[PDB]
Amino acid sequence: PLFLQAEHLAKDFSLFPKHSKQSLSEEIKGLLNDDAIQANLKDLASLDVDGYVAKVIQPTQDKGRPGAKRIIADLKGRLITETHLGSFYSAEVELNFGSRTRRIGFIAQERTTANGAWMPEHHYAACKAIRHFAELSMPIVYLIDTPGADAGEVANSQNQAHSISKAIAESANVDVPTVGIVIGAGYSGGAIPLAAANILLSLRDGIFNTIQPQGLQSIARKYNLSWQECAKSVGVSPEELYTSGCIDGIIDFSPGDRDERQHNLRRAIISSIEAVERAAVNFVRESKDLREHYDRSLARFLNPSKNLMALELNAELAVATSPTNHHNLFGSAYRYLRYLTLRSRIHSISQEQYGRLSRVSVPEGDLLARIQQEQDRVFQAWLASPDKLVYDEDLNKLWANFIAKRDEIKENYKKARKALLFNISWSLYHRWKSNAANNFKGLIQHLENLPKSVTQAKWPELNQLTVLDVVVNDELREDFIWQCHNILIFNSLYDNVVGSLASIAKEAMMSKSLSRNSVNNLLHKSIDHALSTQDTANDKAKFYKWLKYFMGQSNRADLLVRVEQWKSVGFPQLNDSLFVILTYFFERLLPEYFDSESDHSKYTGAINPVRIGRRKDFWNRLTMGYQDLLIQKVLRDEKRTGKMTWENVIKQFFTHFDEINGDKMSANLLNFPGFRLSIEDALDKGIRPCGLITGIADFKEKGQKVRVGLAVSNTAFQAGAFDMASAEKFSALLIECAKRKLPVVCFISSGGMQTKEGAAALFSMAVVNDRITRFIRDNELPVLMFGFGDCTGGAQASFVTHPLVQTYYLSGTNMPFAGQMVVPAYLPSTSTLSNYLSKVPGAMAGLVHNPFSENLDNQLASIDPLMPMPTAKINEVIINALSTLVVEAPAEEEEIVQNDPRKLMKPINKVLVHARGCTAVKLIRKAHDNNINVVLVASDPDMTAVPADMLKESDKLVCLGGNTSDESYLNAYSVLKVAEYEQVDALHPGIGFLSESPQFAALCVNNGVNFVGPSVHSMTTMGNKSNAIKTSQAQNVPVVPGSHGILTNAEQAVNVASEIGYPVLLKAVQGGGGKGIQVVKRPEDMIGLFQKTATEAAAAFGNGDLYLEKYVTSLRHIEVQLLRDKFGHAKVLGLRDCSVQRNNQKVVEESGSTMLPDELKKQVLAYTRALGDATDYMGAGTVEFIYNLDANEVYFMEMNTRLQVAHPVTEATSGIDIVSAQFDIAAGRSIEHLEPKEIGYAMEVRVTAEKAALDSHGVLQLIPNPGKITECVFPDHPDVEIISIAAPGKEVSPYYDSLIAQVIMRGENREDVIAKLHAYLDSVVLKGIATNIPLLKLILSDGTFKEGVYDTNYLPRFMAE
Ligand SMILES: Nc1ncnc2c1ncn2[C@@H]1O[C@H](COP(=O)(O)OP(=O)(O)O)[C@@H](O)[C@H]1O
Ligand SMILES: [Mg+2]
């Protein structure tokens, strides 16, 4: 069942991107190499935002750049057909493949018509062209270049979204190789039908993104950035798109090249089509289920059943329109491959996986203070570099008038003085825009607070004289404070009149004048509103004399037109007639009001629109614009009451809703500014950080239950903005519906695709649309799509309006192609509101009633009685949809089936061991002792290692290839393919490599392979450092004091560090092994050391996330061994002390701690049980504690969610075998029968192949000594255990660790264990290589170590002695 299989495989392939077989980037000949890509990443990192814009954004905007036809012509093939249709350009060219010539289809976005902006008929032409090439078995090269598909009134009237939803449906289901190549810009839903290819490439200077970079300006205004900053933060370069896995490589060609690089475009196409065809043949070799899918699709062409045959007639889709034009078996392979690549381009995580931010050192109401500080920061930056007064002739001529009239004999002085400051305050009001109110308050406060040595300061010479320098002088200072105070009241007056513009519009429609009382009372109310929302000392009478002075300036109309130009960005909801009457009120009716103050007969109030412009149909456009403002107001009242939520939508019709994967959420690997704060805020409110809620519900159809799928949009997160986690939840729901045979109902509301998830979010349009296309075409069950609230962007432009679904809308739904954030200017309710679109053909199967908004249909009939009304109910549509289906006999109910190892835990007689070295020798020895056959996997140096020699004829050895870890053990797909091939009973994930990764645990358990260790839930809870601390806090276990969540920035790190007291630690969340652990001594150091250690974490792991802990200088590293079964018996075996360590790596490890009180030992035993039971832990695990020697306290640090190398020390002293107990637990057995003891004492020395050598100051260090071992004797002794890979004639490899043996001594007491281990280390012989043993012998003959008085920093001090 290929529909179920493609989500399984694509989930597997997205768990480890680098070593997946979805990497076809090696195949294509003519791409740039990974070295040039790494070098280009270093340049783009070191450049600023302007250098990034020049490199990336400016060449795709270039009007001199070769078009789609010119690029296709310079492939130098033979053109067979062309179809130029506006900004669409389809073609068909024969290319030479060396063996012969071949027809290759083309569909391109042509930049030399409409800039590549596609219209509805261009999408319908792309639909047709994609079938036409499929019917003729022609491979297709898509060429992407667009500002996005048109969001205009004509597009949405022609049903733009419904043409794109079909175009994506054809592209996703085409039966020929599809290659995408970005030849310019790939923005939004116009780029995704073409970018939905098998292999998506880009030219060297191309771009691919969620929307055009100027559309990010709305999100830039909300968080106080520029749109250029938001564009770099999103990461839109071809190099960054290749790093995120959005594209499959960068072709070494730009459209203007005429050297060797012009030949790379045809070569990249030839090798791409050949690569997809070789890959698709390899998929038909290995997939026997691809035959079954093809035979099921063939059987529908043989016998077209009436319910799907009627859907194919109405939908017009790419089907077998002939037996000759019926697709081949490889045709279904291109659909399959295309889904796997689209679905591994999208990526999401879970709530347990996401690392929580620090609540510690965060002020109350912080958001407004941080935005105030950003507005002050940009204001202080203007105080540090203000503009010169020579730059504008209008301001320059007023300075000349001012200085001339200042020496002249007092009226002309006062006129020129006031006029200079006035035009400076309008100039800064044009400049500062949406933040102008805040920056004028800060300018007033600045001017009042200025030193007398700056207020009395005489002006610089004209060339160095700035607009700041002009107004800071005392003579211009306090009148400019007055200008700024009146401009604040004007900005409030203007914005209050804009929000009250409907009252003006009504009276203009019904009398053609705005009466004198209506302009008086609107002016009164707007000044009273301005001076009651602002406590400013400048009163109504002073502002009235300024308003007369302003209405006495000759450039007053020009000041209103300049203002209106930048205000049009913030108010894209008003039409031309509404902007004209707004301007006419300020320009003419306010002067006419003053002129008629002396004599009221001079007032007429008459709006003459011709004096602002000869706009046709002015009063009928004013009628439409007023009706649309009332529709906007009604939909804002509906948002503010908040009746259409996911809970309320469910309670109106459905009962016992069971959500599928409610924990799925945004990955956020671009880390967009303020978006992680929004994920935190959502989580603290209990809201899903995901644009969709999905589940299965009961619907009582005439008292009797019917089980249906239910997908309701989450208007509680980002107004229902659809996301990569929403796409995975939709695929999961359609899979549960395909398994159980459920009808699907959907309620969809969205602001569009989540732009703050990167360019990767776009692929969700094609992923979810393909799963709905395949769901109806393989499983027949009806999908309903009730568009509600605002239903816009890519959710609207794909799956909601898809031609096989029954599309519905609630009354009052806003349904355009894109929303207010992206739309440049006003769109009529005739082209946006679902009421007027109800009778427009193909827009919907019906407009239904909104069951929450009581009076809506009468409120809409009072706005326009000729508006089309709703007819059907949501209950009527659902009962008619359910009753016309065949009622198949329902199976007995199953739960939502998830990854559970406990089901897979069956008796083990053959096991895969994922390990090398001493860990593999230990696990191979335990496999013999438990009577289990080993399937061993190994690198080329390790095929002839001692763990391979320890195997029998009944045990297997398999070659992974290569020398290093990357070429062998870290390839998870090779290791899983061996587990599947040998049919292994379980897989032991070893130690090191992928042992502690919950992704590698999930990868095995997806494919039904038993993972020997904890559940994936237990691994993510105690593997995520913030959540491990939060679970410890919940179980009354003291943690190592710190931030407790993850730090945001250097200011956060300073404040949490100050509260703990310096010195302190900075640690990486994805760290471990002592990597990136920086000590910070001071606040002076912390500012530089945070930025530094964030770069260490980002370089080492690809995540700069730091979290802070208290630096304890005198400690013991105490760690406590847990065992636990599936039944819940937390058998805690005992502790170890691993304090003799060198660069965090443990060296001399012990079964007890000589400075730890028995009361604190009992506390860490109780805390291990509390954590083990409260996470539902399984297998072997080790919780780590800092035992502060100064404080006499024990603090939880972190947990090992796997087998620990120190384990044979506790095997001796507990009397319990840790690996045998873990193999019993992973066979499904209980460990209740075990009795943990405290048998004597034990100690381990890690014997490593290292030579002594001095550092730069002369202190002795140990460093690795590789080479062939000539002699190696470990004498047989009863109270020592030897795990070893050292023997005569074996080599110690430079590609791996110097660990050559673990020597674990046992004895009665600690002095006896030390003395026996000292004597045993002298009886042990090693030759050929050097070893660490000269140091180990001296620690065992130290007096301070023999007394047991030391700390974790003992060893580097002792090596210096
Ligand atoms: N402030 C500190 N207090 C205690 N240990 C610290 C501190 N800073 C670094 N460390 C080292 O890190 C240990 C904590 O576990 P860690 O070494 O990070 O584990 P791993 O690297 O094996 O995951 C401590 O025992 C100590 O050796
Ligand atoms: Mg450690």
Q: How many CB atoms lie within 10 A of CB 79?
A: 14
Residue 1067 Cβ contacting ligand 1 at under 6 Å: no
Q: How far apart are CA 1141 and CA 919, in angstroms?
A: 19
Identify the residue whose tokens are 């002592």: 1074
Q: How far apart are CA 1054 and CA 935, in angstroms?
A: 51
Q: Which residue, 1189, 1205, 1097, is CA-closest to 1146?
A: 1205
Q: How far apart are CA 1178 and CA 699, in angstroms?
A: 39
Atom of ligand 1 nearest to the CA of 1186: 4
Q: How many CB atoms lie within 10 A of CB 307?
A: 12
- Residue 932, judged by CB atoms within 10 A of its CB (0-12, 13-18, 19+), counts as buried
Q: Which residue, 1158, 1163, 1072, 1164, is CA-closest to 1121?
A: 1164
Token pair recorded at residue 621: 């456009």
Q: Which amino acid is at 659?
A: E
CA distances from 487 to 423, 425, 468, 1163 (A): 11, 7, 17, 67
Q: How many CB atoms lie within 10 A of CB 1027?
A: 20
Residue 1077 Cβ contacting ligand 1 at under 6 Å: yes
Burial of 333-355, coded b for 16+ CB within 10 Å and e otherwise, reads bbbbbbbbbbbbbbbbbbbbbbb
Token pair recorded at residue 984: 């292994």
Q: How far apart are CA 1101 and CA 596, in angstroms?
A: 74
Catalytic one of 65, 1202, 1306, 1310:
1202
What are the start-end ranges of the H helices in 451-530? 452-455, 467-472, 474-499, 501-511, 516-530
Residue 104 Cβ contacting ligand 1 at under 6 Å: no
Q: In what order do the strands lie in the sheet with 1145-1150?
A: 1193-1200, 1179-1188, 1115-1124, 1131-1142, 1145-1150, 1241-1248, 1299-1307, 1280-1284
Residue 1141 Cα, ligand 1 centroid: separation in angstroms? 10
For residue 1107, what are the β-bridge partners? 1067
Q: Which amino acid is at 956?
A: K
Q: How many CB atoms lie within 10 A of CB 541?
A: 8
Integer Rg of the chain from CA: 36
Residue 1074 Cβ contacting ligand 1 at under 6 Å: yes
Q: Which residue, 1043, 1033, 1061, is CA-closest to 1105?
A: 1043
> Residues 53, 42: contact at Cβ < 8 Å?
no
Residue 918 Cα, ligand 1 centroid: separation in angstroms? 24
Q: How far apart are CA 31 and CA 267, in angstroms?
A: 9
- Three-state DSSP at 956 gives strand
Residue 1114 Cα, ligand 1 centroid: separation in angstroms? 12
Atom of ligand 1 nearest to the CA of 1184: 15
Residue 1197 Cα, ligand 1 centroid: separation in angstroms? 8
Q: Among 1135, 1186, 1354, which is best to mutate for testing ligand 1, by the most ligand atoms less than 8 A from CB?
A: 1186
> How many Å separate Cα 201 from the centre of its chain?
22
For residue 809, what are the β-bridge partners? 787, 847
Please state at what angle helix 556-567 crosses helix 576-584, rounded to 10 degrees: 150
Q: Which residue, 152, 153, 257, 167, is CA-closest to 205?
A: 257
Token pair recorded at residue 1359: 């090596």
Residue 1144 Cα, ligand 1 centroid: separation in angstroms? 7
Atom of ligand 1 nearest to the CA of 1141: 27
Residue 1073 Cα, ligand 2 centroid: separation in angstroms? 6
Residue 1115 Cβ contacting ligand 1 at under 6 Å: yes
Token pair recorded at residue 1050: 């250097």
> Residues 1013, 1222: contact at Cβ < 8 Å?
yes
Residue 171 Cβ contacting ligand 1 at under 6 Å: no
Q: Which ligand is nearest to the CA of 1139?
A: 1
Phi, psi of 753 (to 5 degrees): -65, 140
Q: How far apart are CA 751 and CA 726, in angstroms?
A: 14
Identify the residue whose tokens are 């989930």: 11
Residue 1118 Cα, ligand 2 centroid: separation in angstroms? 10
Q: How far apart are CA 120 and CA 126, in angstroms?
A: 10
Residue 1099 Cα, ligand 2 centroid: separation in angstroms? 21
Atom of ligand 1 nearest to the CA of 1040: 3
> Residues 170, 318: contact at Cβ < 8 Å?
yes
> Residues 811, 835: contact at Cβ < 8 Å?
yes
Identify the residue whose tokens are 């291990």: 1168
Q: How far apart are CA 453 and CA 416, in angstroms?
A: 25
Q: Which ligand is nearest to the CA of 1186?
A: 1
CA distances from 173 to 198, 726, 769, 825 (A): 11, 22, 10, 35
Q: Among 991, 1077, 1119, which is best to mutate for testing ligand 1, by the most ligand atoms less than 8 A from CB?
A: 1077
Which residues have CB under 8 Å from 312's CB, separation 6+? 304, 319
Q: How far apart are CA 867 and CA 869, in angstroms?
A: 6
Residue 677 Cα, ligand 1 centroid: separation in angstroms? 29
Residue 1352 Cβ contacting ligand 1 at under 6 Å: yes
Q: Which ligand is nearest to the CA of 1355?
A: 1
Q: Which ligand is nearest to the CA of 1064?
A: 1
Q: How far apart are CA 718 and CA 510, in angstroms?
A: 40
Strands (E), 35-168: 78-85, 88-96, 101-109, 140-146
For residue 1361, what are the β-bridge partners? none
Give the total residue count for the chain. Answer: 1361
Residue 1202 appears among annotated catalytic residues: yes
Q: How far apart are CA 650 and CA 711, in angstroms?
A: 10
Q: How far apart are CA 762 and CA 347, in angstroms?
A: 11
Q: How far apart are CA 436 and CA 453, in angstroms?
A: 28
Query: What DSSP character marks residue 352?
Result: T
Residue 1069 Cβ contacting ligand 1 at under 6 Å: no
Q: How far apart are CA 353 and CA 347, in angstroms?
A: 13
> Residues 950, 924: contact at Cβ < 8 Å?
yes
Phi, psi of 1178 (to 5 degrees): -135, 160
Q: Among 1138, 1352, 1353, 1357, which is best to mutate for testing ligand 1, by the most ligand atoms less than 8 A from CB?
A: 1352
Atom of ligand 1 nearest to the CA of 1110: 1
Atom of ligand 1 nearest to the CA of 1073: 21
Q: How many CB atoms lie within 10 A of CB 770?
A: 26
Residue 1202 Cβ contacting ligand 1 at under 6 Å: no
Residue nearest to atom 7 of ligand 1 (CA): 1111
Residue 1304 Cα, ligand 2 centroid: separation in angstroms? 20
- Residue 1097, judged by CB atoms within 10 A of its CB (0-12, 13-18, 19+), counts as buried
Q: Which residue, 984, 992, 995, 989, is CA-closest to 1012?
A: 989
Atom of ligand 1 nearest to the CA of 1115: 4
Q: How far apart are CA 40 and CA 56, in angstroms?
A: 11
> Residues 1245, 1147: contact at Cβ < 8 Å?
yes
Residue 1141 Cβ contacting ligand 1 at under 6 Å: yes
Query: What DSSP character marks residue 672?
Result: -
Residue 1184 Cβ contacting ligand 1 at under 6 Å: yes
Q: How far apart are CA 1206 and CA 1198, in angstroms?
A: 16
Residue nearest to atom 24 of ligand 1 (CA): 1117
Residue 1072 Cβ contacting ligand 1 at under 6 Å: yes
For residue 847, what are the β-bridge partners? 809
Torsion of CA 687, 689, 694, 699, to 10 degrees: 20
Which residues have CB under 8 Å from 187's CB, separation 6+? 146, 147, 148, 207, 209, 210, 211, 212
- Residue 1101, judged by CB atoms within 10 A of its CB (0-12, 13-18, 19+), counts as middle
Identify the residue whose tokens are 């920061």: 377
